[PDB]
Amino acid sequence: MKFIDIGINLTDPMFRGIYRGVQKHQDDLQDVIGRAVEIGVKKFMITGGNLQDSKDALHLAQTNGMFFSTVGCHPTRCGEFEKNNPDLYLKELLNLAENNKGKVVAIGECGLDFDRLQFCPKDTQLKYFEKQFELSEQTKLPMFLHCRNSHAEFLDITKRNRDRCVGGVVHSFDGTKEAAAALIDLDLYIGFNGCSLKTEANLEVLKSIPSEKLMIETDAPWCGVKSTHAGSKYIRTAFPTKKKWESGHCLKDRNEPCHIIQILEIMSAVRDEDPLELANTLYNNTIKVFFPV
Ligand code: NA
Ligand code: NI
């Protein structure tokens, strides 16, 4: 099979064995990358969520021809516009994307998260998500979008500004069938990781989406599938794992890009579709949006 992980936090210190500035185990990032390559991951989109993190994502993406990155400001970080001067901050994000055309493939992560108002209030989130359509309009890059507990406001901004972006994906989607149908009507794609598959209602929503509008991702080291999640029973491929780090083993409770196969197994069993046929469609959809040239 072949995969493109549209949302992988490859810069996370967990992949270097680092926990709050402390070396807990040997840096195993290259081993993590190697396990993902072995299962068929061909490209990795390393997510950026503010100016500095987008620079960090780009700097890691420059280390390997399989790696790419995004530039944008996550809803939880949108206080950085007023802190730094909003027009300067926007221009810094714009320059970072425009000067790095090979590696930067999307504007984002951006959108809304009304379960995280303690990090950035609603008004600031709405204002600065909408402002980022200046980045998509100028760069002609597709968007990598976030929506939690905010469909109505998210749809309003996206629908009003649809002609200001070439396309995009609503990643780690966890909304209703009506929300998914409204997003597909705007010619947007729907991304699934483990966090999109936790409930029985999430599985039913997945069934309602045409396969030509789906993408796949892990959000590793987060969103690992747990037995309490509705789709866990469908996972078939396991990896050697240890609770205390050991060479050649995954670390218990740390998700990795290789675990994208488990997301594929869930999606294909839920939809009653051949696993490779669905994997190939997901790959082709991702190329069309993020790698068409
Ligand atoms: Na389960
Ligand atoms: Ni072993």
CB 142 within 8 A of CB 168: yes
**Break-preceding residues in the chain (C–N over 2.5 Å):** none
Rounded distance between C-alpha atoms, residue 170 and residue 3, angstroms: 18
Rounded distance between C-alpha atoms, residue 41 and residue 144, angstroms: 19
Chain centroid to CA 148: how far?
A: 13
- Which residues participate in the annotated binding site? 109, 146, 171, 219
Cα→Cα distances 260→103, 162, 192, 266, Å: 22, 30, 10, 10
Residue 62 CA to ligand 1 centre (angstroms): 38
Residue 242 CA to ligand 2 centre (angstroms): 8
Say whether 207 sits in a helix, a strand or coil. helix
Q: What angle do CA 43, 267, 3 make, to 5 degrees?
A: 10
**Cβ neighbours of 237 (radius 10 Å):** 12
- What is the β-pairing status of strands 189-192 and 104-113? unpaired
- Phi and psi at 201, nearest 5°, equal -60, -35
Residue 185 CA to ligand 2 centre (angstroms): 48
CB 277 within 8 A of CB 204: no
Task: Determine the residue type at 158.
Answer: T
Taking each helix axis as running N to C, give the angle between helix 122-131 and helix 86-98, from 0 to 180 degrees, rounded to the nearest 10. Answer: 40
Say whether 102 sits in a helix, a strand or coil. coil
Name the resolution in angstroms: 1.2
Cα→Cα distances 224→1, 195, 198, 218, 262, Å: 20, 8, 10, 8, 9
Experimentally, the structure was elucidated by X-ray
183: containing domain = 1-293
- Token pair 């740390």: residue: 254
What's the CATH code of the domain at 75?
A: 3.20.20.140
- Which residues participate in the annotated binding site for a divalent metal cation? 109, 146, 171, 219
- How many domains, the chain? 1
Rounded distance between C-alpha atoms, residue 80 and residue 17, angstroms: 29
Taking each helix axis as running N to C, give the angle between helix 51-61 and helix 86-98, from 0 to 180 degrees, rounded to the nearest 10. Answer: 10
Q: Which ligand is nearest to the CA of 231?
A: 1
CB 97 within 8 A of CB 104: yes
What burial letters (b/e) apply to 30-64, b meaning 16+ CB within 10 Å?
eebbebbeebbbbbbbbbbbbbebbebbbebbeee
Rounded distance between C-alpha atoms, residue 293 and residue 150, angstroms: 33
What tokens were used for 76? 């939880």
Neighbours of ion ligand 2 (CB under 5 A): 240
CB 45 within 8 A of CB 4: yes
